[PDB]
Amino acid sequence: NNPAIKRIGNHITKSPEDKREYRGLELANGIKVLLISDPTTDKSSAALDVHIGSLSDPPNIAGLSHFCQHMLFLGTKKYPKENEYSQFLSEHAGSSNAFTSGEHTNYYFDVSHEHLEGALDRFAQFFLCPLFDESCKDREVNAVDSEHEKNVMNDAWRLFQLEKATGNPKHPFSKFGTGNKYTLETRPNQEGIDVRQELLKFHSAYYSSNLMAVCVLGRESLDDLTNLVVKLFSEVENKNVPLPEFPEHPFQEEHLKQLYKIVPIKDIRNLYVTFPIPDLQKYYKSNPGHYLGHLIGHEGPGSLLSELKSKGWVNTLVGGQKEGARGFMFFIINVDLTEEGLLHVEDIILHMFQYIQKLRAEGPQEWVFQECKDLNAVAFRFKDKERPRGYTSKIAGILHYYPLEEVLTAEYLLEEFRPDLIEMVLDKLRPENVRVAIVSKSFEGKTDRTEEWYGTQYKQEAIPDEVIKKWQNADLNGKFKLPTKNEFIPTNFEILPLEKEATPYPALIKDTAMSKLWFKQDDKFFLPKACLNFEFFSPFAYVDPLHCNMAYLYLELLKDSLNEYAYAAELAGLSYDLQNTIYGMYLSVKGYNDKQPILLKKIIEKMATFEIDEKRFEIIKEAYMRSLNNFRAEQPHQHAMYYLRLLMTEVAWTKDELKEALDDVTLPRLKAFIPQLLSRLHIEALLHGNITKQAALGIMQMVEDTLIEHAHTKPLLPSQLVRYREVQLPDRGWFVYQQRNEVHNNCGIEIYYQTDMQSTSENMFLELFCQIISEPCFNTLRTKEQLGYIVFSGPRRANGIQGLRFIIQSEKPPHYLESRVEAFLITMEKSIEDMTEEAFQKHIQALAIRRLDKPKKLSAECAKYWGEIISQQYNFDRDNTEVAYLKTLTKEDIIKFYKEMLAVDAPRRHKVSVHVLAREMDSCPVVGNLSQAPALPQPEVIQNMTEFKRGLPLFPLVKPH
């Protein structure tokens, strides 16, 4: 009937709460398709996932399929302009990304809902006729090189690659997926390879319709989405490529019973325990590896982790199954190590085996399966509506694994109790099948191997037969008990009717010395959930580096003692976030509203009556000192951002001041700080969700009453509700702060052009200018000039003040990066002069759509309200108001804004730059085809942050709405 369609699936199973409509189909050429119609959506989206990745790279061109992923964006026959795709998305309120894993290359975008076809037409060409232009191939290899360079000194990437280097060197698993300039240009040139032909051959060979899945989400009817996808994708050619498969495990006999001793970059101590397993993917209706991951990774009473933590050996544990590829998987148990735990690795692993033995002894528990199943069914029914871009991307990957009809449910719904599969996987978790890796700075100078891609220092050893035999004879330990029934499992899903006095925005329903309560009953999502957000103000959380340490330590110690009890709640969809701030403490409780007052009451009560276990105190103090030290290993651009915050904020304690004050934190001293912190508070809260005004007032007053009861809390004075100010930079001044990153051999730079206080006009001048320069400067500073992989521009907002920032990480020195940003900015003035009024209005419209895009789920709406609350602007209707103003702006207005605040000879230019030098740039000068860079003045070099701050005015704070 339709030659272009092989079949239309039956009804796609969805949550009864899901108003989107769905149609599955397979095209004649083999492409699996899901169409999602959402007549409400502001942004439309599509994604395509090709079932080939890294594991299919040619053995002689490592990173090719990842390079090819980069190259596809850079022009096609129909749309040859190198940034046609990204320009079009940017001008229509869209964004795009892609990723390459071992078996998939996944490409996705969103866009304004009226420009779906235009975005999709351009996207579709990536799969039809890429140009692989020779000149952008030569440029873009630098971006990929620069992606690898940022990962080199990253502990997680070094470990990911080291695993692959220690399995069978003949297995595709051993491949280096990222590639670099060496693998992708230098060595291919040496070996006479034409990389353009290789990209074309690989695309021709594997970009076959039979390995593709496409997902499209739009306002259009399912018939209209259907015709669209047929129109654009049925020309993709079927080469009938067999799906790559890897039935032989990369870890064979000689790779089992091995021990690795690895030297990390950061001062971290971890143990990684791995068992190879078969591919359990086909068992998704029973999911035996999840059942075992739930048990072995449990954190409640009776758990593996409870015992290892009581012994003072470990603080956290991850366990369960881990993906490999079609044909192989892994089962892991990874723990961090205390200093004692480091000396007790053999005992830790014996406990692991005793816990596993306990699972064998008790047998598979249908009631455990049934709990998993019940929780998954509730999670599925009440799942938050996803943002279109992540939703289409994720479904495109899974269309390759599940029947069309099951794609939404397949990952949630458990159907089959399989005690036979559970025993089978359990039979793999034996000491004869074990790989053990220990990461520790203690192994420095004690290693004799080097992994080639990252430089990782390590040593390999057979585990002694004596150690194995002892692990094999692990018997039952009375400390290990299966969890009991999870009582946090919610059963009340009633949606309270909308109150007669319910408001579109949060209403201030309580305004007392003690607490300010903003409340909104959900009028949009209608799921049985709520968010309860509390800011606790106290000047004692940040009065000095010592107090700041104590605030941190107190809250980590609290979360650590609550952890056993809160883990059940967290499995049951009820979580909390508790952290110290520069103003006090932040608490958020989210998830099913049912049992949420219980967890909340427990937290406040524990906080207000807290008793510190001295052993937990010492372990967590040592972890925190390392955590402060480990900042030295963060990335240069992260360093640049951190220093700018320190420079621009009235009060900010540095990592070095914090670490020096940490030796002075004693138990007695922490015990005294806590009652002191809690003796006087102001609480500002947002309670938002499936809750009434009276339940909100009750939760609020329960929190105060618990603090009053146990901690004798008294209100703060209004005048002590101290917000910090941003440093006010002088007209025409340019200051430079310089540091070195001692770990990474790239530079980072952050450049800040401070404008003025936030307000309706200043906001939208800045945001419009940003919108306009956003794609161009990625295109200029990355795509064309290839300064680095990380190239960022956009508004910076802090402390009621704002401005334009640029963040780049590069091999080039900061003074150089600076001239290029300055050259770029001139290009942008000319470009704004040269652009049509309609081009101008498309930018206003794109920013408009971006600002007006509706929250799809509760917590995204809360976050918007919460940003208004914590900034003390309380501008809940900002979006309509800012957008109405924006549409008023002209080309002339933006030219004038640029000329006044931003241009190199602007009368009110306020520029600060943070320069972070690469490990190997020794010292360095602060000042120094391609567009022409203007001459810059001599910067004032900041020598001392305190003096810099003392010598400048401070801005006002923004007035509340």
């Binding site: 991951g293 956290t316 991850v318 366990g319 369960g320």
Partner: peptide
């Protein structure tokens, strides 16, 4: 925790 996410 269960390996994810």
């Amino acid at each position: 925790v269960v390996s994810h996410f």
